[PDB]
């Protein structure tokens, strides 16, 4: 009859509630009318092609604007002293001083300074001209199309796959490991040795000459013969100019380690070697499980056989195979969990080990990328912990999982939750305690009475890596051991050079200030996990509500009876954790940024002393770096940072607006609207017009969402405005 | 006092408030308007005409001398590190 068509019960709502909820439930296929397992699987599979189409289109546009409105070529010729251009600006509201200030990077008009690091990435892989960027944009536009073509193709009956096909896991793993991971990594190693590395050295190897240009002097033979060391005889000289055939070796596969001294980035030869190396593990690994040829494993049976006799895990993992394969919420929560972990692994390894040329010197880009991925990694983790409860409520079969490791979690759930409470309470009581204590004496003017615990455990790890600072005498920095000498030159000499670099971010110096914050982050992790698992383990029910299983993942509440039951659903527990997640990542990004902007200014001394007490954070970090930001537009002038000053205030406004939906609740607003409904009816010249949807206050759950969205958007945008401007201003 | 299942209307605020006026008309000048306002009375046809009337906005911006689209000229700042 009406929108939403997928929900008839929703479509018959006379109020404005239907339009809202029609949007918020469009992707929840399992709740749609007359849903079948068949319809469920190839809706996702088709929605999957839709997502790919967006990514390729989004990436196509990036290659387009940089080629059309970005200099790039000007950037290539002097990567150190030119600012990359994202795209042009066209805004009628712009005053002349605006068009003025934003004209940068040698552009004919006002543009935006790119902080995505696409310039360094594209330059490192071998893109040298705008023409190259266009061909990529066209190719991605074409890739974006065939994704839609495949999406449309499998929605057709003559090409649609069976659910069982989707549930054949043994073969999907075998291909994804061997093909999706292995081959793609192998193919990339080819681009590196054919284009990236030779493009780095100085030769332009492209489609019209790649067929006639050897990647290596010696033939393809040495690989096939067996002697592969010949691919490492002649590496690039330390004093090598990128994009210049100066001090350029011939080797296409090395393990030098450390950084290319001019670019401060990892060697391309190391990477061409890396991907080639990992491709194999993936390639062999993608041949573990059984398919149609008579050899291979059975995942189920391996899970079945893993039962420790004599307790204490019970039935082990029996029936666990079918619980996962029949539940795509388990799979997603399992996927987000793994993806979320390596998302941070990207953030941690990309600032410590820069992969692209001239990215380490672009301090605004480095800060942005780390902060970017940590918040991305943050939200992903809350999703892995969100599809968890949904699995328990919608897809969990208690009987089929009788006394296995999964079912043993629900029967001692009070143990996991209470100790998470203890660990959270422990960390909080002392981390906050040590902080406040330190502020007291500095107020009292006696900073020599502070509790400054030296992170001696972590410093012991640093010395174990090769850092000759401190007197620890541990592996890779000791007097006699099998570890360092296993270096056998190769990685160690180039890498040990890199670790004792006082300039790079590769293993910075840490102290008492680094101790307190790491505990704050540990507090943030534990508490967030406490909230999320408690929502998961009590998703099917508690003692306050034993039949929570019968109400679904998201419901408003259970009423004011039995003392009150506000925010008792597993959905709300997620919604509460999102707050704690933002706080945690907030502390992480604060800690990363401040320690770096003090390092970049050549003044780590200020961080080492001000980070030990909380007033230092608010003043020497928050207050101190805001001056240039908040003067983006002044009652006297107008700078290029005016965008960020405005967005800074914008973020504050969205943030505070969420507070309205989180503090004030529905019954007040509904009664207010009822008076407004009366008004409109009794007002002449306005009676002629009537609404087609009954005006009602937002729902209890909707408001918690809407408020959280405001809270999260303002949270991000405010810090984004500050992270960029404060860093861009000083550089 | 006065509820009548017979007429459900007066029972409710069905009645038009005395602001209704079903009186006569206005001068014959209408004969003119009815002639020239006819093409816009069709609906849907008018919906389209106005949207394609958005072709005006394109025309007005493609050609516009006095909107800030020029620096006007300056020598740009380097500026924090060039």
């Amino acid at each position: 009859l009406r929108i939403p068509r997928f929900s008839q019960g929703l479509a018959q709502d006379p109020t404005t509630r239907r339009i809202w909820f029609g949007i918020a439930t469009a992707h929840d296929f399992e709740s749609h009318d007359d849903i079948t397992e068949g319809r469920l699987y190839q809706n996702i599979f088709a929605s999957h092609f839709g997502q790919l189409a967006i990514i390729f289109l989004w990436t196509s546009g990036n290659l387009f604007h940089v080629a059309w409105q970005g200099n790039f070529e000007a950037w290539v010729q002097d990567p150190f002293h030119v600012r990359p251009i994202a795209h042009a600006i066209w805004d009628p509201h712009f005053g002349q001083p605006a068009v003025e200030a934003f004209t940068r990077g040698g552009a004919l008009g006002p543009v935006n300074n790119a902080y995505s690091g696409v310039y360094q990435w594209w330059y490192t892989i071998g893109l040298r001209t705008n023409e190259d960027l266009y061909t990529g944009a066209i190719f991605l536009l074409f890739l974006s199309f065939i994704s839609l073509l495949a999406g449309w193709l499998h929605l057709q009956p003559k090409w649609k796959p069976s659910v069982s096909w989707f549930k054949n896991a043994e073969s999907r793993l075998n291909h994804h490991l061997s093909g999706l991971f292995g081959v793609s990594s192998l193919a990339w190693a080819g681009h590196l040795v054919h284009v990236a590395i030779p493009g780095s050295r100085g030769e332009y190897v492209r489609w019209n000459n790649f067929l006639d240009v050897l990647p290596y002097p010696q033939g393809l033979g040495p690989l096939l013969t067996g002697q592969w060391n010949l691919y490492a005889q002649n590496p690039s000289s330390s004093n090598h100019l990128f994009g210049t055939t100066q001090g350029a070796g011939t080797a296409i596969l090395t393990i030098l380690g450390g950084f290319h001294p001019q670019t401060q980035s990892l060697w391309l030869t190391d990477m061409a070697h890396h991907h080639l190396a990992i491709a194999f593990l993936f390639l062999i690994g993608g041949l573990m499980y059984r398919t149609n040829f008579g050899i291979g494993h059975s995942i189920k049976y391996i899970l079945e056989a893993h039962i420790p006799p004599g307790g204490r895990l019970g039935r082990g993992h029996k029936g666990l195979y079918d619980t996962i394969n029949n539940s795509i919420h388990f799979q997603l929560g399992l996927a987000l969990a793994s993806l979320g972990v390596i998302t941070s692994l990207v953030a941690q390894h990309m600032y410590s080990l820069p992969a692209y040329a001239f990215i380490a010197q672009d301090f605004t880009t480095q800060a942005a990328l780390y902060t970017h991925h940590q918040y991305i990694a943050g939200f992903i983790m809350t999703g892995a912990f969100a599809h968890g409860p949904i699995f328990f409520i919608r897809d969990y079969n208690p009987e089929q999982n009788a006394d296995n490791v999964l079912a043993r979690m629900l029967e001692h759930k009070e143990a996991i939750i209470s100790h998470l409470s203890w660990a959270s309470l422990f960390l909080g009581f002392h981390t906050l305690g040590l902080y406040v204590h330190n502020d007291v004496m500095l107020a009292f003017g006696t900073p020599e009475k502070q509790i400054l615990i030296e992170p001696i455990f972590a410093q012991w790890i640093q010395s174990a890596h090769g850092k000759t600072s401190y007197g620890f005498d541990v592996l890779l920095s000791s007097t006699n051991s099998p570890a360092l000498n296993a270096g056998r030159s190769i990685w160690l000499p180039g890498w040990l050079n890199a670790i004792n670099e006082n300039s790079n971010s590769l293993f910075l110096t840490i102290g008492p200030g680094d101790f307190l914050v790491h505990h704050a982050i540990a507090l943030g992790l534990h508490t967030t996990t406490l909230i999320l698992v408690k929502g998961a383990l009590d998703a099917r029910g508690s003692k306050l509500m034993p039949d929570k299983k019968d109400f679904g993942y998201s419901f408003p509440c259970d009423g004011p009876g039995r003392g009150g039951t506000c925010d008792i659903s597993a959905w709300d527990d997620f919604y509460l954790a999102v707050f704690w997640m933002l706080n945690t990542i907030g502390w992480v990004t604060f800690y990363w940024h401040w320690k770096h902007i003090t390092l970049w200014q050549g003044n780590v001394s200020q961080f080492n002393e001000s980070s030990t007490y909380l007033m230092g954070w608010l003043r020497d970090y928050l207050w101190l770096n805001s001056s240039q930001l908040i003067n983006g537009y002044t009652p006297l002038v107008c700078n290029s940072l005016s965008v960020w000053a405005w967005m800074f205030l914008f973020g504050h406004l969205v943030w505070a607006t969420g507070f309205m939906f989180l503090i004030s609740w529905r019954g007040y607003w509904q009664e207010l609207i009822e008076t407004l409904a009366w008004a409109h009816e009794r007002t002449p010249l306005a009676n002629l017009i009537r609404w087609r949807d009954k005006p009602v206050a937002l729902s209890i759950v909707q408001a918690r969402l809407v408020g959280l969205v405001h809270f999260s958007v303002g949270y991000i945008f405010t810090y984004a405005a500050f992270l960029i401007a404060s860093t861009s201003g000083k550089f | 006092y006065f509820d009548l299942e017979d007429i459900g209307n007066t029972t409710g605020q069905w009645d038009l408030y005395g602001s209704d006026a079903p009186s006569p008309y206005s001068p014959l000048q209408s004969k003119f308007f009815e002639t020239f306002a006819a093409p816009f009375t069709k609906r849907g046809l008018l919906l389209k005409f106005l949207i394609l009337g958005g072709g005006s906005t394109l025309a007005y911006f493609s050609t516009t001398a006095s909107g800030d689209i020029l620096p006007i000229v300056k020598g740009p700042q380097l500026p924090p590190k060039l």
């Binding site: 009406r2 929108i3 066209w90 | 919906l47 949207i51 958005g54 906005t57 394109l58 911006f61």
Partner: peptide
């Protein structure tokens, strides 16, 4: 060139919001 497109990026909301409104009240 680039002064023709951001407005059709604003004609489009006018068109989209109108069409969607008709779709949701139907």
């Amino acid at each position: 060139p680039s002064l023709f497109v951001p407005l059709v990026g604003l004609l489009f909301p006018a068109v989209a919001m109108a069409s969607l409104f008709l779709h949701v009240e139907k």
